[PDB]
Amino acid sequence: TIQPGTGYNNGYFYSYWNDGHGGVTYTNGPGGQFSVNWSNSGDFVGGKGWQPGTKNKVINFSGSYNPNGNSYLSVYGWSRNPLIEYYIVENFGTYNPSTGATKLGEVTSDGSVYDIYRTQRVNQPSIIGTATFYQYWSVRRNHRSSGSVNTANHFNAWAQQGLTLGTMDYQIVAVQGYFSSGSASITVS
């Protein structure tokens, strides 16, 4: 669609990355809109939001999300110091990203209970280069493709459980895929 990279579009930060396998297109639309179309893709992530994010943002999203295979729809971002990759997963495809992960609690927010987990990435790519870092997850039990996410409820619950976030880096609503197919059209605000 557009070239993989980051930048700004109609007031919103955007990030689109892929592994070069092919099979995925990403486009930026008016306002906070973005679309992703994929067919037998590789690894990729794309979406719109903010740089930097905040710890008390109420993120609104709306649209369609039709994965065929392994993909997630999430409020997604990172913190620095400590380096953390985090997800508030609103929907997913064939794989629940918390499969086999250590459960760290539950939090109720925006119409559903979410299960909290912590995982670790070892010597993997990150916003600061190859590194070992933790990932925090809130996985929504009631899947959806529109709604509002009160990020503070998640960040506070994570903190209560000992999952600390550093200074915020980017924070976006993202469609992530791993060797799958699908389509999505989401508007963020």
- When divided into structural domains, the chain yields a total of 1
CA dihedral 152, 117, 111, 85 (to 10 degrees): 50
Residue 81 and residue 132 in contact, taking contact as beta carbons nearer than 8 Å? no
**Which pair of tokens denotes residue 188?**
């963020």
- The domain of 25 spans 1-189
For residue 27, the surrounding DSSP H or E stretch is: strand 24-28
Q: Which residues pair with 172 in a beta bridge?
A: 49, 76
- How are beta strands 43-50 and 58-68 bridged, if at all? unpaired
Q: Edge to edge, what strands does the sheet with 33-38 contain? A: 24-28, 33-38, 181-188, 58-68, 147-150
Bond prior to 67 in cis (omega within 30° of 0): no
**Which pair of tokens denotes residue 126?**
């990150």
Q: What are phi and psi of 111, to 5 degrees?
A: 90, 10
What Å resolution does this PDB entry report? 1.1
Owner of token pair 């037998």: 40
Which residue, among 114, 79, 111, has the nearest Cα to 96 in the 3D structure?
A: 114
Q: Solving technique for this entry?
A: X-ray
Residue 109 and residue 151 in contact, taking contact as beta carbons nearer than 8 Å? no
For residue 162, the surrounding DSSP H or E stretch is: none
Residue 119 CA to residue 100 CA, distance in Å, equals 9
Which residue, among 42, 93, 47, has the nearest Cα to 70 in the 3D structure?
A: 93
Vertex 12, ends 141 and 19: CA angle to 5°?
Answer: 70
List C-alpha distances in Å: 106 to 31, 54, 81, 123, 156.
33, 22, 25, 29, 12
User: What DSSP string describes 55-117?
Assistant: TT-EEEEEEEEEEESSEEEEEEEEEETTTEEEEEEEEESS--TTTTPEEEEEEEETTEEEEEE
